[PDB]
């Protein structure tokens, strides 16, 4: 398994954990996992900045950042 695919799966696991916790109404756990997905996605952006997948990484970073900013206001 390449470094790209391995990190992509890591980001996915975090993202799934965050959306699950989010829907269960656990703002903090949702936020923790979103941040961890963002950090892995930022790493993927550094490693493959000029590739075609980067636009999707960058899109998801922003979606997750925006969900963080909403959930932060609760708690």
């Amino acid at each position: 398994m390449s470094a790209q695919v391995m990190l992509e799966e890591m980001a996915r696991k975090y993202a799934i954990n965050a959306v699950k916790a989010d829907k269960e109404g656990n703002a903090e756990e949702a936020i923790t996992n979103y941040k961890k997905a963002i950090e892995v996605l930022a790493q993927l952006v550094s490693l493959y900045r000029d590739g075609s997948t980067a636009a999707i990484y960058e899109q998801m970073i922003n979606e997750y950042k925006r969900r963080i900013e909403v959930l932060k206001e609760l708690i």
């Binding site: 996915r12 799934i16 959306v19 925006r66 969900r67």
Partner: peptide, 11 residues
């Protein structure tokens, strides 16, 4: 290139 499966969108 695309992610398959898609990364989940937030609520």
């Amino acid at each position: 290139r695309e992610l398959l499966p898609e990364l989940p969108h937030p609520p």
